[PDB]
Write a structure and sequence with these properties.
Enzyme class: hydrolase
Helix content: under 10%
Radius of gyration: 20 Å
Family: Belongs to the peptidase A1 family.
Protein name: Beta-secretase 2
CATH superfamily of the largest domain: Acid Proteases
Strand content: 35-45%
Number of helices: 5
Number of strands: 29
CATH topology of the largest domain: Cathepsin D, subunit A, domain 1
EC number: 3.4.23.45
Structural class: mainly beta
CATH class of the largest domain: Mainly Beta
Number of domains: 2
Shape: globular
CATH architecture of the largest domain: Beta Barrel
Strand order of the largest sheet: 2-3-8-4-7-6
Keywords: Aspartyl protease, Autocatalytic cleavage, Cell membrane, Disulfide bond, Endoplasmic reticulum, Endosome, Glycoprotein, Golgi apparatus, Hydrolase, Membrane, Protease, Signal, Transmembrane, Transmembrane helix, Zymogen
Distance between the termini: 41 Å
């Protein structure tokens, strides 16, 4: 009954998309960030001045400690928590309770930030990324076993320029339009997919396709912006600058905002992904609406560099309906009715295209 799950997320690209969950007995209500870039279920376990509620294990008769803690470190921020298990229910989806591993954060640094509305995180990626180790069964793997649902979830994000949907156990036809296009998961850790080509203003960037997969290309709803490995970032900046022509250096680095819509002055950016048929690609396209982001207008460049990954973050996922088909080791993309600003399209999907002139394997 996927219709219950429609309209179950709040938030946006910048502050995250979050699901309401009930944890323990009696149920304590938390706001949980949906994060396809990690694999732990972790919640505030102590008071923090930037959050309004935390999970108190001592008030839950069904909580059981697992006898160890875990420390998680990100490029920015970290936390240490107690590892236990408890019953969860997701009101907007699964009104029958299920037992999951949970980390209750008792210490942290730059994790719970000012202005943020979530107080834990739901890591939806694979066991290989679970901490302390892959033996700590992920939240979604627990749900699949116990609720006997298909090993698939999908996400509609509607905050382009509001909330959206997290569908656990499959696909809701009302959340997309036209054809679904699927690309293989190259490696089950992050949702790693194979990027063949980037195209700015209809003109491909002149980089070996290995540069787009440098370490990894991934789909991550816990990342705000489109993040590009430094080399790709610098080439994209030059292509966009030249295809527009309005620039201070700070605009590209997020040091400065441009105040003026400007969208008509900037080019389309297309990312080409290998199809489940090896001999074909398809293309996901963001329009300036998704990467020239109004702030209050004043506008920020919605693309940043990464050291180690090309990350298809929430600002790009706001353009599409995205299917995490773990059962068939593929990620699907489709056109999304809610990807609009004033009823105007902010993205395009198209295919197929020939892969005759790209290498057989762009992943190094």
């Amino acid at each position: 009954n996927f219709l219950a799950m429609v309209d179950n997320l709040q938030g946006d690209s910048g502050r995250g998309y979050y699901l309401e969950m009930l944890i323990g007995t009696p149920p304590q209500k938390l706001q949980i960030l949906v994060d396809t870039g990690s694999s732990n279920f972790a919640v505030a376990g102590t008071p923090h001045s930037y959050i309004d509620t935390y999970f108190d294990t001592e008030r839950s008769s069904t909580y059981r400690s697992k006898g160890f803690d875990v420390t998680v470190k990100y490029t920015q921020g970290s936390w240490t928590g107690f590892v236990g298990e408890d019953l969860v229910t997701i009101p907007k989806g699964f009104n029958t309770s299920f037992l999951v591993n949970i980390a209750t954060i008792f210490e942290s640094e730059n994790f719970f930030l000012p202005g943020i509305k979530w107080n834990g995180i739901l890591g939806l990626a694979y066991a290989t990324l679970a901490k302390p180790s892959s033996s700590l069964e992920t939240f979604f793997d627990s749900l699949v076993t116990q609720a006997n649902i298909p090993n698939v979830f999908s996400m509609q994000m509607c905050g382009a320029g509001n909330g959206g949907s997290l569908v656990l156990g499959g696909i809701e036809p009302s959340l997309y339009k036209g054809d679904i296009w699927y690309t293989p998961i190259k490696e089950e850790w992050y949702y790693q997919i194979e990027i063949l080509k980037l195209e700015i203003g209809g003109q491909s960037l002149n980089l070996d396709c290995r540069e787009y997969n440098a370490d990894k290309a991934i789909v991550d709803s816990g990342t705000t912006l489109l993040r590009l490995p430094q080399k790709v970032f610098d080439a994209v900046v030059e292509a966009v600058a030249r295809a527009s022509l309005i620039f201070s250096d700070g605009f590209w680095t997020g040091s400065q905002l441009a105040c003026w819509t400007p969208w008509s002055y900037f080019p389309k950016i297309s990312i080409y992904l290998r199809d489940e048929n090896s001999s074909r690609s398809f293309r996901i396209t963001i329009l300036p609406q998704l990467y020239i982001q109004p702030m209050m207008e004043c506008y920020r460049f919605g693309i940043s560099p990464s050291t180690n990954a090309l990350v298809i973050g929430a600002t790009v996922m706001e353009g599409f309906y995205v299917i995490f088909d773990r059962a068939q080791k593929r990620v699907g993309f489709a056109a999304s009715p809610c990807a609009e600003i004033a009823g105007a399209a902010v993205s395009e999907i198209s295919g197929p295209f020939s892969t005759e002139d790209v290498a057989s394997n762009c992943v190094p």
